[PDB]
Every structure is written in C-alpha cells, then in structure tokens.
C-alpha cells in the first residue's frame, strides 16, 4: 500500500532522540506524517531533510540554541519564546513528542504536519507560498481558517496550516474544501 | 529559515 511506502520513506527521514521518550507517540507522529503525498516525502528524502523528534525543548538542540529568548514571528504578545515552542519547520524540521494535538502549546490542527509543510514549501516547492499565484489565493481565503492575525497575515503559515488540514484526515480535508475551495484545488493540483 | 506553529 502507499501508506506503507510512505512509512518506509519516512524511516529514512525521521530521527529519534537519544534517551527515554514516548516510543508509541513517536510512532503515531510518523504514522500521521505517512498520510502526506509520497511525492513530497520522496523529495524530502532526496534533499536529506531530517525530521527530528525531540524529548526536550527545541532550543536545547545545538542548531537552535541561537533562538533562545527569541520571539517567533507572529507570536508577539504571547509571552513565549522559541524555548517554549513545540515545533519548527522550514530548512529543517524539529518536533517535540507529545505535542501533536491542537492546544499543546500551539493552535495548529496538527504540529508535525504543519511544521513539515513548511519544509515542503521551502525546500521541495521553492517557497511556493510566496508565489503570485498563492498570494492571490491567500488574499481571498487566508482569513477563513481562523487565527486571522496569524494565518491571515503570513502566506507561508496559511499554506502550512491548509496543507495540514488537507492531509491530516478526511474530516479536516473536508473542512478545508468547504472553507477554502481555491486553496483546496490548489493543493489538489500541486500533488498531480 | 524557521517557521513556528500557530500560536
């Protein structure tokens, strides 16, 4: 099955932490990532993009120590810094095990899909969220998924959250189709 | 580049 293939592809991309961690939940996070279209996963593998699962704070990792005390873009006024943020995506991907669900230090529909969508946007699709095509779709529908002061202002964030809705499960996929039809069709064609 | 989740 395609999901099995995607899980095999992910076995070459996911990095598990050393020490004690929740192995069952880490597997659950991988299983949810396996719903992403294989074309994107294969491209992540080809670019040697690693999806790092973490048992501690992001900024405890050497490569993110420079973000200690830094307030993420769009997080102004939350009183939180990258030290408190459970996931990160872009040129890399890093995710705290156990914080997948909405409300676990974030309000994304799913942490690992949102973060990985950033890496797909930036690495695989050469920042398509900044393209003129997407900006026109973002201008119309970017305030239709809630969190309008964040998703409605940053097209890369609207892309990542829409991507997460599309691939998390059938319920969120349907919700995106109803709320953001042009975005839905855009993602549908993106995978062709 | 780095991007956070939804606050």
Swiss-Prot record, chain A:
Q: What's noted about domains in the record?
A: The structure of Zmp1 is similar to anthrax lethal factor (LF) metalloprotease domain IV. The S-loop of Zmp1 undergoes large motions upon substrate binding and seems to exhibit a function analogous to that of LF domain III, thus contributing to sequence specificity and substrate binding. An aliphatic-aromatic network and the diverting loop contribute to Pro-Pro specificity.
Recorded hits in InterPro entries, A to Z, give: Anthrax_toxin_lethal/edema_N/C (IPR014781), ATLF-like_dom (IPR047568), MetalloPept_cat_dom_sf (IPR024079)
* Entry keyword NADP: no
| Protein origin, superkingdom | Bacteria
Catalytic activity reads: The enzyme catalyzes the hydrolytic cleavage of peptide bonds between two proline residues
Gene Ontology CC: extracellular region
Q: What happens when the gene is disrupted?
A: Cells lacking this gene retain CD630_28310 on the cell surface, show higher affinity for collagen type I with attenuated virulence in a hamster model of infection.
Which terms are listed as keywords in the entry?
Hydrolase, Metal-binding, Metalloprotease, Protease, Secreted, Signal, Virulence, Zinc
ATLF-like domain residues: 7-192
- GO BP of this protein: proteolysis
Q: Where in the cell is it found?
A: Secreted
**What is this protein's record name?**
Pro-Pro endopeptidase
As recorded in UniProt, its EC number(s) are 3.4.24.89
Q: Which residues form the active site?
A: 115
Q: Where is this site: Interacts with substrate peptide?
A: 107, 114
**Which family does the record claim for this protein?**
Belongs to the peptidase M34 family. Pro-Pro endopeptidase subfamily.
Indicate which residues the UniProt annotation says bind Zn(2+). 114, 118, 150, 157
Quaternary form? Monomer.
What does the entry report regarding how activity is regulated? Is inhibited by the chelating agent o-phenanthroline in vitro.
What does the UniProt record say this protein does?
Zinc-dependent endoprotease with a unique preference for proline residues surrounding the scissile bond. Exhibits a high preference for an asparagine at the P2 position and hydrophobic residues (Val, Ile, Leu) at the P3 position. Efficiently cleaves the LPXTG cell surface proteins CD630_28310 and CD630_32460 at multiple cleavage sites in vivo. Has a role in the regulation of C.difficile adhesion versus motility by cleaving surface adhesion proteins such as the collagen binding protein CD630_28310, and is important for efficient infection.
Provide the cofactor list for this protein: Zn(2+)
Main localization of the protein? secreted
User: Positions of the site: Transition state stabilizer?
Assistant: 150
Positions of the UniProt region annotated as Interacts with substrate peptide? 73-75, 89-91
How does the cofactor bind to this protein, according to its record? Binds 1 zinc ion per subunit.
